[PDB]
């Protein structure tokens, strides 16, 4: 009664461009996290094996053991930079400033989260202030929501009239990454992969597809 169609399956030598996501010259600030659609390709993770000294890799809602057998309509790669001690928040069901105000994974999340330390790239001894996160918001984010407003936050009771000051903060904090910090305050690059299967022909398959051609 339904169908299963291979009309949009990929050429088996056409590997998903994961490496290009991972060796980007610069990553996004987490408040303005960046998303990349991956499709019409084979999701062979050998292309980023040992690409960096990875810190964490965990999947949610799908088992990594089954991944190479699986097919998807799309993969979404979100990438940003956060503090060492905030990585635990890039997972379902977390709270804290990153999970509440910057990047919120849903409870039914299906995908994986890869993180690595990038001190030697993202921290000047002068201090790299280019990386920011959102410290203040009136409310928590919805799953996969993005917020890039630079409206002055009214902490207290008196309106701020768009001018910062006592109880009126700019809502973005910088990390000021300097190489001498504790790992908790060092920069970690993060990539979140979303695996999507709508009711349509798939366009991404794991490398197990490759065996049929022998």
């Amino acid at each position, epitope marked *: 009664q339904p169908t299963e169609s291979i009309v949009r399956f990929p050429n088996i030598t056409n590997l998903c461009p994961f490496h290009e996501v991972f060796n980007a010259t610069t990553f996004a600030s987490v408040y303005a996290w960046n998303r990349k659609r991956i499709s019409n390709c084979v999701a062979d993770f*050998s292309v980023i094996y040992n690409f960096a000294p990875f810190f964490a890799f965990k999947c949610y809602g799908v088992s990594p053991t089954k991944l190479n057998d699986l097919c998807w309509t799309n993969i979404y790669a979100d990438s940003f930079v956060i503090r060492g001690n905030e990585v635990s928040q890039i997972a379902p069901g977390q709270t804290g400033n990153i999970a509440d105000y910057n990047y919120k994974l849903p409870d039914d999340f299906t995908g994986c989260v890869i993180a690595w330390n990038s001190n030697k790239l993202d921290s000047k001894p002068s201090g790299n202030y280019n990386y920011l996160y959102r410290l203040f918001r009136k409310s928590k984010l919805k799953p996969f929501e993005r917020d890039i407003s630079t409206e002055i936050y009214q902490a207290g009771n008196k309106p701020c009239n768009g001018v910062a000051g006592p109880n009126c903060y700019s809502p973005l904090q910088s990390y000021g990454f300097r190489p001498t910090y504790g790992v908790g305050h060092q920069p970690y690059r993060v990539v979140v992969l979303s695996f999507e299967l709508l009711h349509a022909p798939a366009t991404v398959c794991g490398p197990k597809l490759e065996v049929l051609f022998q």
Partner: antibody
Amino acid sequence: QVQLQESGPGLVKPSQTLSLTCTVSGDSISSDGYYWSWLRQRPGKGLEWIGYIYNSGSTHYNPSLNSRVSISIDTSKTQFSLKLSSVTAADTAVYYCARALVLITYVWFDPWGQGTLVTVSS
Amino acid sequence: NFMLTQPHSVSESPGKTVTISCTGSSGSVASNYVQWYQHRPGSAPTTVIYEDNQRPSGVPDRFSGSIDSSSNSASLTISELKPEDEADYYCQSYGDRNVVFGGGTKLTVLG
């Protein structure tokens, strides 16, 4: 099911090169997500990873052995082999081959060979 | 670098439950998947747990793996213990660009 079988010389003179081979049956080596791995267990010690290879030809080996290790795949795609140079008595061990499922930091060894004992002795 | 540490031996009586922990240093064991291998002298090592807590087909539900980030440990737990459960058990994971094995624990079924 895939089945792994080591084979190689029982005895190796100190400072020469250990060569082993794994024969893979019920399956073949290809760019399908699986890596092909050597490990070992020295006497009284525990399991110790050596290195593995993907059909792309990329290798990764244990840092404490990396200089001396070299793994390769036979063009028949039913064997891979281990070479370990300048062995000493400390390389006496049971050497195992295994299939490895490898994604980022997730490596799961399964199944394993039965191991072949290699003795370094004059 | 990232190391996993297991006690050298554990023992328990048949039918009871025994736990084998695997404790990290220079790293967070909850950050990367942990496997458990059973190794009977003279035999291929086999898998009792992969992906922290998954059981291959054929491994009885008496085996179960758990992770505890608060004490930075991983645990294999064996219930309804049998004399055939005697083996060395190894935890394994990854960290600092290297496959990492715990030193192994010998399990002894007493009584």
